[PDB]
Design a protein around this ligand. Structure first.
Ligand SMILES: *Cc1c(COP(=O)(O)O)cnc(C)c1O
Ligand SMILES: *Cc1c(COP(=O)(O)O)cnc(C)c1O
Lengths: 420, 416
């Protein structure tokens, strides 16, 4: 009534920065909205099983540290992070990976490894910069980086890691056009990739360090899942191979302790870490001291690597159930393939050419079986015949039943499209 | 060679280049020494925290509510907490008419400042703030290459004559679209201690409406009032279409929870959700649910009373000591704060509280030099003092130390 206000809205939308205009929302929650319905079976999870968390122990420690250590735990803390937790982290890295030679100034804690990704983006990426990552890649990293108007150099991922031939070709092109200064870093997930379940070979790890050196790049090694190994041996981290001069290591408590703590660990050069401290201080002053000290006391009192063993046994069992069900129900469709993940939370399944797992998702919802369509993990959002599956949450019998439902989905959709 | 350090510095973005570290950590490095007395703190006294109440609740929500507290949560924040905030806003300020989609929780009010800056500021944008201003806002905004319209702060708030003159100049040069918002701290200013009068609050809303700006009202301290009556928030006057309201649990419950409350229009909040999700996915559910069950179970406004008695006592001891020990020094003034954590003191013309800091360090007495709160880093005769942490006897001893410093420096400068 000449009061079409919304105009106030267009004025606000008018005030939004370029970063603001280039922000993306994850659609995962929307599409998994009904995934917990009674007769639904969901493989769309990206999370650990909460039934595995040491809740009684964390609860007792939480009370104790608030009551007795409140001068630390309820008060503002340093941006640099809890030095008691730092001691425990330095110990874990040495016990887990044989990483040695670091001190407290090589580390900082973030609000998840997500904040680390966001702050690395903020400090290093702009509309004139490039970052190198996989196809497929972790969604959090794509969204954290793309908001800063970054350009991407996308390299296809193979069963043993990134295709280093493609990587070298692309980098060579940048060099020949005198644009290699615009390329900043390579983002990798070296153990049990999200979404691909792939583990980067030692030889490709070493080769990545060499390529980074040649083109004066650093490497951001995101490693949420390394402790969750079901077979084989732990591979040296890229961080151990290149050192903090060349590599930033991101670990998290999300997958091995509790997402709710929101604790990411960043290890790097003292110069790099000083810059993350500056960025984090303007971003949130500090992390909640409550979370840091809780984790720190837990780790002092319980050996995480030991306490993980029954959780590893459980996830291994479930991984094997899914891989067996895949072999039983997906072995007669030519062109189907999947990564036989040796750790972590995911199996990445790829259907034959022509299959579009986004288009197919309607048939899946109709059968109440859920996965993450592969397009979600593509920087440029093109159609995908792949999907991410997680075996972590459903009970064994539902893993088998869910995989049978997916077969039915594939057959229905495949036949409607004259692919089968 | 070690100068791939140079390569890394070459890789850093413009935002990364325009980033200011806080100096306060550096200047207060030795302020916890044995014989030292510090007025430099900007933090509450941990001896006032409801540590027993919070500890019990923490155990309960981790053990019994773990599906919520130990798992990822929504970026939007805990709805249980949101229902308590809606109640509190009404009981504290008489604010009504909001729902959950007008709220989000951030990792302190600091993250809210950072996300507002990210979303609204860039090298072609301006925001309006006070001289002096809160350092956390200065640093959160400057990182995004923002230009500042700085307005002198008077004892009852911003000089609005200056504000309207400067915005008029923008408007006359057709640049008013580049001005995004006005940042204010309406109760018990950090660092100034001042409270904006209701008249200036209403006028601020009019100006913002006239020039199509929004107002970011940062209010950490409103509940720590030692005398007088609570004033209507700017948010209550302009509403969510015009104003974003920032509250925090830091000064009234516990800084270590890292909980800022942001209230605004549903469109604004949705953009904040989008920005937060890429920044950190979500805040720790443990912190939110802890605060929620605390507020359900204990009346914060009642639990604050002994805290207010303590702080008010210390405040008066400091003012009384300033009276005793600065009475005979012409030109010195200070804000007789009625709330919050700070007294803002100004020395005579010619005194430079940065220069003078070396004499203070020598007497082992600490303050925050006023230049820290100045966007353009020019010399200041002022300093921020806090009365929260030192025991009463050290408040007196410390103010006497400060007198001796002012006299030592002033004599050397031939100002006294
Ligand atoms: C799960 C995951 C994360 C977890 O992020 P947090 O913020 O630490 O909880 C980070 N990176 C990758 C590759 C992941 O899969
Ligand atoms: C104390 C203070 C803050 C509180 O910061 P948090 O990040 O919520 O802990 C914010 N704004 C002002 C003006 C302050 O004085």
């Amino acid at each position: 009534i000449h009061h079409h206000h919304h105009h106030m809205v267009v004025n606000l939308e008018g005030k939004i920065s370029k970063i603001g205009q280039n922000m993306k929302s994850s659609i995962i929650r929307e599409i998994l909205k009904f995934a917990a319905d009674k007769d639904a079976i969901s493989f769309g999870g990206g999370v650990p099983d909460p039934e595995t968390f040491p809740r009684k122990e964390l609860a007792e420690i939480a009370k104790e540290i608030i009551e007795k250590e409140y001068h630390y735990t309820l008060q503002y803390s340093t941006t640099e992070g809890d030095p008691v937790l730092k001691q425990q982290i330095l110990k874990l890295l040495e016990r887990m990976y044989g990483i040695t030679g670091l001190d407290e100034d090589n580390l900082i804690f973030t609000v998840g490894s997500q904040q680390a990704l966001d702050l690395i983006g903020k400090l290093f990426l702009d509309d004139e910069s490039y970052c190198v990552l996989d196809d497929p890649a972790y969604l959090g990293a794509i969204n954290a980086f793309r908001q800063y108007l970054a350009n991407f150099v996308v390299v296809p991922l193979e069963d043993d890691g990134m295709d280093l031939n493609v990587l070298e070709r692309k980098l060579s092109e940048f060099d020949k056009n005198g644009k290699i200064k615009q390329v900043k870093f390579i983002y990798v997930v070296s153990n049990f990739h999200n979404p691909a379940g792939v583990t980067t070979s030692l030889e490709k790890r070493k080769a990545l360090v060499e390529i980074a050196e040649k083109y004066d790049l650093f490497i951001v090694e995101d490693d949420p899942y390394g402790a969750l190994r079901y077979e084989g041996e732990t591979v040296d981290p890229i961080f151990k191979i290149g050192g903090p001069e060349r590599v930033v290591l991101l670990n998290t408590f999300s997958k091995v302790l509790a997402p709710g703590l929101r604790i990411g660990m960043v290890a790097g050069s003292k110069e790099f870490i000083r810059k993350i401290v500056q960025a984090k201080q303007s971003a949130d002053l500090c992390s909640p001291a409550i979370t840091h000290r809780l984790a720190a006391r837990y780790l002092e009192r319980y050996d995480l690597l030991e306490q993980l063993k029954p959780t590893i046994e459980l996830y291994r069992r479930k991984r094997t159930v899914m891989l067996n069900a895949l072999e039983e129900y997906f072995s007669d469709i030519p062109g189907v393939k999947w990564v036989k993940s040796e750790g972590g939370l995911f199996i990445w399944l790829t259907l034959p050419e022509g299959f579009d797992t986004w288009e197919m998702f309607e048939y899946a919802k109709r059968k109440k079986v859920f996965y993450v369509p592969g397009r979600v993990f593509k920087v440029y959002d093109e159609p995908s015949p792949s999907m991410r599956l997680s075996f972590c949450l459903p009970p064994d019998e539902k893993i088998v039943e869910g995989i049978k439902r997916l077969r039915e989905v594939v057959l229905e959709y495949g036949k409607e499209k004259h692919l089968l």
